Symmetry: D2
Subunit: 138 residues, 4 copies
């Protein structure tokens, strides 16, 4: 199923993060299915807490970053999306490597959207499950 | 009305982010009342999204960073807190200066804690309100 | 702090629940301040979980019930609100009497709103903290 | 696979609700799978808001009700689960019939669990998506030296 309303390439996406938070974290997308969007992120002196574990906020940064663009790719023309509510359950820690976020839609309405982003570690072990609720602004 | 079970100094506390995400982002705790813990964060290239505004994940990184430490200061001995769930509602954007997050407890149990982190802009306007649920581990 | 764009009395307000869940759970509005709405609900056979304590879901029905109407009162004309997301933390259980829900705004925009509802037991202690995000419909 | 640690019949599962909220909203567990639990709820005057539609709070009642027991079934002995926090997205309304809740585990930790409950209408359309985080409370007698 194709949910995307706009067309884009990993090239353009990754370009977005340069100059802002997304950039200074090395978050790079790596897939764009018909109804799915993936991305990864490291685990170092930028995405870790004072104990050397994948910071929970880092996972949310990753979740929101992907959900935001994905929601955008589901709109038309001058439309835009703004994240309203986000939540996440940290069910497993991470200390090294890169985590991959898999974003899928739970609901794509005309005025708002709900995105689910599951984050897994290199071994494929689920570390975080988050949801993003956005509003479509004309 | 005094909740802390571990005495700490802003100096030693701020020291926490000396090589981890909390440092790279310039988060600096500035207050330690009987039941509240504050800390500001810079709204710059490091914490902004592709459009120049504060990134929603930055708001959550701040929340979860202030909540993790508040929770820890409320345990004793070898105990530790692990973040379980976090939720945030972005009610207002911010594009300049420093955002302040005021953390207070909603509940301080013996097994779990619930923290409320309200993030304001330099104008004192709520920008993000979030809750962090922690688990106390022996 | 007069947030209400509409006018309504406790009498008219409570008459909304007759014949629906609100009236069936005996949820009763008891205060309309300039920027807050308060309502009580019994902790009984209709609101308890299998072990004699207040069902967490009942606390959420109270929360959404107060937040929905409050949202309405903050619009006007043919405008109406629709709940998008609601979350809550159960921090203390209630076993008897009635709990009291207190709702106040966190954001009232032209497109959506965020409401915070705190639920207390008969002793004035926090039992549930929740947030509701609505969307305004023209 | 089999996540359940306790063996319960649907009959015994539904008997738990008599006399309380679950029984009063006619919430009926109708299926226990290897790693899923399902319950139904009528969309009527007891569960509708003033405008004649399914009350979002009811949906959360259904979700927490299913999630709570699923969490209990995944604990042995006198152990127990306590609901910590819940969240839900209302993505579509309902006005008649029943809605069905389908609870799957997202995490079955040693100290806490995360449950996902999706509520569907008659046509299999998602009306509410919810997550419940619970804490496991230890229980049972302990050996002591003598």
């Amino acid at each position: 199923s194709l949910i995307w309303k706009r067309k884009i390439t990993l090239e353009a996406l990754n370009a977005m993060g340069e100059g802002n938070m997304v950039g200074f974290l090395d978050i790079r997308f790596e897939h764009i299915g018909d109804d799915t969007l993936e991305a990864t992120m490291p685990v170092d002196s930028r995405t870790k807490q004072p104990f050397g574990l994948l910071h929970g906020g880092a996972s949310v940064v990753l979740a929101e970053s992907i959900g935001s663009v994905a929601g955008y790719l589901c709109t038309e023309g001058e439309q835009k999306v703004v994240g309203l509510e986000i939540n996440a359950n940290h069910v497993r820690s991470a200390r090294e490597g890169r985590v991959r976020g898999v974003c899928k839609p739970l609901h794509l309405g005309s005025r708002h959207q709900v995105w689910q982003i599951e984050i897994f570690d290199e071994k494929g072990r689920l570390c975080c499950s988050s949801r993003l609720t956005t509003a479509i602004l004309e």
